[PDB]
Amino acid sequence: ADIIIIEEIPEREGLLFKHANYLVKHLIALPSTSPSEERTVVRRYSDFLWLREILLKRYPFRMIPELPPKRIGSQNADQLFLKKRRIGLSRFINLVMKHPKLSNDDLVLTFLTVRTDLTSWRKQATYDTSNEFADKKISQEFMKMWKKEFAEQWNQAASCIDTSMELWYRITLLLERHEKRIMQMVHERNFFETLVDNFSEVTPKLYPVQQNDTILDINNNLSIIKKHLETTSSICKQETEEISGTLSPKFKIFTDILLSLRSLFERYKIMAANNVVELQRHVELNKEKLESMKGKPDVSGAEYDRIKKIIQKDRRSIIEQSNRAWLIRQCILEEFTIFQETQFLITRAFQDWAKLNSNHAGLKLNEWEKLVT
Amino acid sequence: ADIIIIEEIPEREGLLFKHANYLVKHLIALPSTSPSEERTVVRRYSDFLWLREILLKRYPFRMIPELPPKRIGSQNADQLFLKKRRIGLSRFINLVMKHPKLSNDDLVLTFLTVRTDLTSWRKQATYDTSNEFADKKISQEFMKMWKKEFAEQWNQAASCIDTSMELWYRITLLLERHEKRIMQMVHERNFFETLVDNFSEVTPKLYPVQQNDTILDINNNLSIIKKHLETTSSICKQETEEISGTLSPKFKIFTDILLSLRSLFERYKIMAANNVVELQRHVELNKEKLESMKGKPDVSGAEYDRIKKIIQKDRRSIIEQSNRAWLIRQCILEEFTIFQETQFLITRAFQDWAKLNSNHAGLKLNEWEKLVT
Amino acid sequence: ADIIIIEEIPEREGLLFKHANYLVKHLIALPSTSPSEERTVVRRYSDFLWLREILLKRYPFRMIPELPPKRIGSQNADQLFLKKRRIGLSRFINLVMKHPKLSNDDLVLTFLTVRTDLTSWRKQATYDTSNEFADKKISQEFMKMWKKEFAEQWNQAASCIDTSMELWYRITLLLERHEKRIMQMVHERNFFETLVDNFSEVTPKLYPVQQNDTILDINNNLSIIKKHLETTSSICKQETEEISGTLSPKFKIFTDILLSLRSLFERYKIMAANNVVELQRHVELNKEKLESMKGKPDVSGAEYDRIKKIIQKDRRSIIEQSNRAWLIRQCILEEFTIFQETQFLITRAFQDWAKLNSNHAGLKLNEWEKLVT
Amino acid sequence: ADIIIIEEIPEREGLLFKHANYLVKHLIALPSTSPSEERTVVRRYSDFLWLREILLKRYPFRMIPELPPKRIGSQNADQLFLKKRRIGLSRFINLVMKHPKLSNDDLVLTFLTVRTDLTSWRKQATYDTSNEFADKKISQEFMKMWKKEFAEQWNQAASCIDTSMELWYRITLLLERHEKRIMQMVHERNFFETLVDNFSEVTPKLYPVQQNDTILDINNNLSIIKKHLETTSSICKQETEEISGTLSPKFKIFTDILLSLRSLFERYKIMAANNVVELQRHVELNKEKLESMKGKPDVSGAEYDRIKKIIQKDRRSIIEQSNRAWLIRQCILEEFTIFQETQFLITRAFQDWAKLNSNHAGLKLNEWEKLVT
């Protein structure tokens, strides 16, 4: 559902700043709600915050996109830190969409197909039906690879992701810098046009006309050149806006899925820390229960009942933690899936990069050789 | 005589700074001294100062190139303000050479063909033989155009030259700026290569290999891209050094002949100010001598002899100033000649500009399309 | 235990980069290990990583300082991104120390008092004794304020902390910028000294001495001024290094405790999400068990035993989750404590700021008025 | 006659640019025209160009101020390159005024006391009465010092002036840079005020009020600090505008008299080049006339009359050139006078510099120590 979020509209512009109302333009192919012709919904940045928090509460250990930068920032006045917000926002929701469990979620579509305001929804909020997977499900192969190799597998990814996140950030930064470079270049290029026009006009005043005529030939060649520079600068700017504005998402989506897996491994490490403590209790109880086999020799109902309660609560504990451990690792793999899709995504990124650079260079070469005449 | 001045050598480098000894490499076609195979002479920046001052003293109202910036500047320590000095110096002397009267001058060739030091020359300095043209020469048409149109003609050039000097300076400045731009670009391009190499290396650590192999395909594509960027940056730098270093003189020579005509019109205005005062005396004496025709009625030998001395000295004065006025205007025209050569020089400048930009763009397009594969 | 970590030493410097060995200089007042005279221990950045991870595993919902930026960064070659690492590292450990539970922890002191390498420690790692607080402890007032006002209380802090984190970051950024400003200023100030010396030396060459002597008075006044500028620039640089280098931590510590509470509320929200799901199960089971009171009318041992297992496991569940909920909120308050210490810390920050600015301005005023003479 | 030229007015502002009409505000103490109460005259930049050219034509080898930068520049659109023009213009005319011969000139006062337009003046232009000093005047000591020491004296100044011109230019540049520095500083200072206000407002939201009250004390201290920064930034800006705007001329006047003596030595070298050629003819005729003393032995009226004409015209030539040589050197000295006034001018410059820096530092110290409370 490649949906677009453009024409963000707060209450009308002034000194102040308000939290814009974003038109969620449901360009729809997913049949959760049957694919509409189009059905816009007005929703806010606060609405998308509610959205993400609810996603986080319902679906743990699943891919989750970033947020747009904060609205309670120091000074978020001008339109830049709102345009970035809308482009990011589009990327964020649409990323939610390509992801499987979210595209199938109930919460998302209700967030999509709704015409009233947030409060009426709050009446039927009722996310109590939408919470943690407490159900035991039988893995076909209860031992596929979840610790034989996958443990070290994503243990290595845990660090490689921060490394590669810095890397890819620097890379798309470099592309943005190339773009601002070329925009400065077209600036001074039009300045150059101004100069060559003034120079054409001050060639006769400096080079006699009524005596020599070739000057007219040459300061008409310079008119050829001012027109060349006009066209060259225009197509520079065209490359800037079209090419780079539509190239940047092709890069940024990788960054966002990367830091989404960052968030994921953070949540995972700090919650599977519970299984860490539980395995430490595993060894602790192994030890205390092997020392327990003194036969319980003294006739003591107190010791009997106390350590019976101990072992029984610990037994239901170990079974529930094993249930939870497998139920976690499975979702880890479910996320590894679309991460291996991001794999091919980097391919798409670099190939589009080279292609559009080639288009730009081709037009520029054609312009140059055209000028040489 | 396209002579080159490279390998400027002061006493050896240290904290201090000395006035380098410039190897004047007489790549010679002018037969003043018969065209040598090559004959280097060691000469200093001070030597070229002596040169220019002597030229100025001997030949007034003739094209004269600039000097290199000052050696008694505030801080002229590092090699930049000496390399600019040597390139400028080459331009300055070689410009002296293409100019007719200088190429025919005696002073210049002696400055060229000499093997001793400056002092022995100072012994035979003897520039008393080389001074102002005091001789009357008969203009064929004593009225060609020297005031009917040429007066206003170069009166207009007097201002157009400062205008066009600023213009052309800005233009060649813009080219230098384009060059420094592209050098910064190749800087960050090699940084980009570093990044993509690190990214290739952290793709497997983040994208499983023993499971998925396509990652090897893609991070070998990125090796293709790092090699592309290596070649692209190398040829960027090649364009920088070769193209722009050998393009800049093609521009700067126009600037130097322009400010040479600037110097010329300065000297001319401030010395023909003498003819200005002389024409004011012309009208003053016209008036006083028409009032003089009272017949000199009183019998007075004092008044007779005094106003006779007046009229006779004023008569030799008016004839000598007319001699000088025509003898000046003629040299004005002699300079207008090579200025009308600079006319075609701007043509050469812009055409070479476009051509070498086209070469660069062509190589870059070939690199891009080669990469797309 | 205001301990210092200076003279970070990797294997010797070269092209490469290694993970320095940090001398933990136990300037000790805490008697966990009795206050030593001093006892340095060599430990690495990797060692401090092991440290922090272990802290995180053992003590949840407690103040925890940041890490230094990553060692697997893109290009961390030069010494800047290692000096920042050592200053940060000192701040990080020493912050661990002022915090109560950490200062009392067993893990930390062993990390401190140890002379062998990390591996021998790994033999006696034995952090199984050091894990999650599973014990029930009786809050004196089991209802102090943990939801009547404290819920909204830190709910508001949840957002105010990101706001104030941006703010305080900008503020200490501004101070660093002021410092770099003044360093650039002392740069051009010494350039100014160079200029005025050259100007003194070229005053006589331009202002006749053998005629006029007052020039000696004035170019000795300028010697007074060059000496003034020498002293002024020196004390500028002194203010830079001393004042700002020792002022910056006074600011940064607030930023680090702020983002420590950031990390805390992150962990807390995403783990108390478990209590969120548990309270949703609370309402769900309230509902299903009120619907359950059909008397269990049909004679069915299956339904009887199944819903008996349901209610019993849910009952032990609700008691364990209430135990955990209170056991969490208590640690929340324990952290609120030192946060209310950071309160006065901002006071210390601003007062030291103003004071050292005043010292600098005072010295500068004294220098100026001293110069006026 | 410290006259001021403010409220430059072209035809009203638009896209275009016109040559403003400058109100010459005759704050008059010189009685050439008796000191008026005040008498404004409207005059243009073109009018001042006519002025300077006329001065140059009438008075050679006398101090002459610069022009304002060119009006036919490439792009002189915005008001900066007109405000600099008006400040420069004021400096230029007022410098003309402090100079003796100009203050006594007839041309200047007519340029001052005039109410019609430039054309009516052009009717009575009549500068034929105002031209070169052709009169012989008897130097009391015909040998004061004009070559015994003054020759080398200003020969040395010829180069020292370009050196010191670069120096003093760099110096006043450095002051302008200090000013722009402090303006950027007050910019970020007011940004800092914005930050500390937002920080005060987000201290309670982050630091509990209903529990802890000291936060009110501290975020009222920060109100003290925001007011401090308000006042500090305001007085920073006051120092900027008042101090530096009124300090800069105190520096620039030295630069302008310096490059005025630059122009002077240029004119002098290139016109006394005539006396150079005349002294070369002096030695040439000494030689040819000593060789002439063959007695004129052959009976030849042709040779007799020809070399008699030679010697007689050369004799009147040598007497007229000696007249001119002394008449030049005298004006050289007349200019050396006010140059030795510029001597004390540099004193005034540096002393005012130090004083106003001291005022600024004093106010800033008072503000700081006031804040410490």
Author numbering:
A (entry chain C), B (entry chain D), C (entry chain B), D (entry chain A): 129 to 501
Question: Please, what does the article write about this entry?
Answer:
SNX–BAR proteins form a subfamily that is characterized by the presence of a membrane-remodeling or curvature-sensing Bin/Amphiphysin/Rvs (BAR) domain3 in addition to the PX domain which, typically, is a lipid-binding module. Mvp1 is a poorly characterized yeast SNX–BAR protein that shares conservation with the mammalian SNX–BAR SNX8. Mvp1 was initially identified as a genetic interaction partner for the fungal dynamin superfamily protein Vps112 and is required for retrograde trafficking from the endosome. Mvp1 also deformed liposomes into tubules with mean and median diameters of 49.8 (±13.4) nm and 48 nm. Mvp1 is therefore involved in membrane remodeling and cargo sorting at the endosome.
We determined the structure of the Mvp1 tetramer using single-particle cryo-EM. The local resolution of the final map varied from ~4.2 Å (within the cores of the BAR domain dimers) to ~7.2 Å (the tips of the BAR domains). The tetramer consists of a tight embrace of the two SNX–BAR dimers, with the two concave faces of the BAR homodimers facing each other, slightly rotated with respect to one another, around a central axis through the middle of the BAR dimer, such that the distal tips of the homodimers pack adjacent to one another. This packing serves to occlude and sequester the positively charged, concave, lipid-binding surface of each BAR dimer. Tetramerization occurs via three main regions. First, residues from the C-terminal end of helix α1 and the loop downstream of helix α5 in the PX domain (part of the Yoke in the SNX9 SNX–BAR structure) contact the distal end of BAR helix α2 from the trans Mvp1 dimer. Second, the C-termini and N-termini of BAR helices α2 and α3 interact around the twofold long axis of the tetramer. Third, there are close contacts between the top of the PX PPII loop and helix α1 from a BAR domain in the trans BAR dimer. Together, these regions generate a tetramerization interface of 1278 Å2 at each end of the tetramer, forming a combined interface area of 2556 Å2. The structure of the tetramer suggests that the concave BAR lipid-binding surface is sequestered and the PX lipid-binding pocket is inaccessible.
